[PDB]
Amino acid sequence: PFKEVSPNSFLLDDSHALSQLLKKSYRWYSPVFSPRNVPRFADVSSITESPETLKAIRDFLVQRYRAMSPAPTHILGFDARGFLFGPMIAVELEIPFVLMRKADKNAGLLIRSEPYEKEYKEAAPEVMTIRYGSIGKGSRVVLIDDVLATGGTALSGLQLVEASDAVVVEMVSILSIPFLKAAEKIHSTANSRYKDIKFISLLSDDALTEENCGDSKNYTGPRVLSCGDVLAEHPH
Amino acid sequence: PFKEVSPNSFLLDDSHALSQLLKKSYRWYSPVFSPRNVPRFADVSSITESPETLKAIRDFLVQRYRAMSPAPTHILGFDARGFLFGPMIAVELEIPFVLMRKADKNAGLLIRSEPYEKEYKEAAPEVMTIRYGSIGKGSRVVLIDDVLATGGTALSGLQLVEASDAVVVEMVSILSIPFLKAAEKIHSTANSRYKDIKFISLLSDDALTEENCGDSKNYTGPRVLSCGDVLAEHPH
């Protein structure tokens, strides 16, 4: 079951088989072996390439929403890693999977989010969208993505669902980075207007150790190799 | 069953329930209501937001790969729309779902594709990657994406699987645009080196009519609305 680690922010108890599987499967990479400058980049591929882990995520969440009352009406996934988990849950629940993407990636009349201005040593916030009418009045939406880091896109999701005159069931993520205090900040911003938004995570990055490092040890070459170069490494 | 519309390019017979459901569900948008300058932008959301259609795609393809011999070992989906269909099939087949993404989106040591130079009135081709070792020697990979248009990324997929010393089972897409002759061009390029690559599609865009137009009729406003503006349209 989910334990409240902080107000309206729940974490799956680490005894659960899903939590153990995630801890075992996850792989993170350091700057030299990743595309972003963060200490540990948690690779979503380490999850999707694991059949057992992918199935455990699907089963747990589907069971969770089937037993939920009132039941969710929609699943809104974030571009692009949220697309990896949303559809397999939505197909079982038999509800629509809506896409949250940048305007230049979305079709139809769109509704755009309004991100806050960035703070010193910033990092530009993303304006995200959903098609106008993809979610209606009375819709109960589950927001999904792989990792809850700073919470920028989660806030975009909240704004878009609110603008649509619908309610957020909860923000679910496979992994959370509690240090970045996304849930805490969202829960207090603008006089606690989002205080009632529930956040659920299946694993905390604090559970990831050196054993989860996917970095190649004692490697001094480039991070990216051309397909022609890789071809020359074997008889073909 | 799949019919050969051209050498190694198969289309699901339009009598199939899956083909009928796709024709009924699909929605396309013209330039003013889409993010790309094409006559008809086939919106993948019209598929994912349709529970019945999403389930029909999952059931058909899963059944197809379970009855396949030798059975596929991996499913490689294209960023980001391929992420929408791959995982729900891979979870049932209990095989890995590998991600093909641009280098600045992928973790670990990567293998990059080598796209051809563009032709007059061009449109810059994308260099795509997969993590080195995500697919090994002897792997039988199914490539998946929503639409087969020019085939640029499909070729990247083929190159990456080939470089990995693995074989392509087939390139599958929900929708194909036969007019752009992607299958024909890939099958002849570089002295027919990819002649044996099978292409399967579930629906041809020629089946999409005006009835599938998602455009708002007699609308003169902007394509994108801010969440604040949408909020003012209803009591809140």
TrEMBL record, chains A, B:
It comes from Leishmania donovani. PANTHER family: ADENINE PHOSPHORIBOSYLTRANSFERASE (PTHR11776), PHOSPHORIBOSYLTRANSFERASE DOMAIN-CONTAINING PROTEIN (PTHR11776:SF7). Keywords: Cytoplasm, Glycosyltransferase, Metal-binding, Nucleotide-binding, Purine salvage, Transferase. It catalyses: AMP + diphosphate = 5-phospho-alpha-D-ribose 1-diphosphate + adenine. Mg(2+) 2 binds at D145, T153. Its EC number is 2.4.2.7. Mg(2+) 1 binds at D145. Pathway: Purine metabolism; AMP biosynthesis via salvage pathway; AMP from adenine: step 1/1. Residues 44-200 form the Phosphoribosyltransferase domain. It is an enzyme of class 2 (transferase). CDD domains: PRTases_typeI. It is found in: Cytoplasm. GO terms for cellular component: cytoplasm. It holds the Pfam family Pribosyltran. One of its GO terms (molecular function) is adenine phosphoribosyltransferase activity. Gene3D superfamilies: 3.40.50.2020. This is adenine phosphoribosyltransferase. AMP binds at R40, A42, R81, D145, V147, A149, T150, G151, T153. Belongs to the purine/pyrimidine phosphoribosyltransferase family. Adenine binds at A42, R81. One of its GO terms (biological process) is purine ribonucleoside salvage. Homodimer. The keyword Cytoplasm applies. Its main location: cytoplasm.
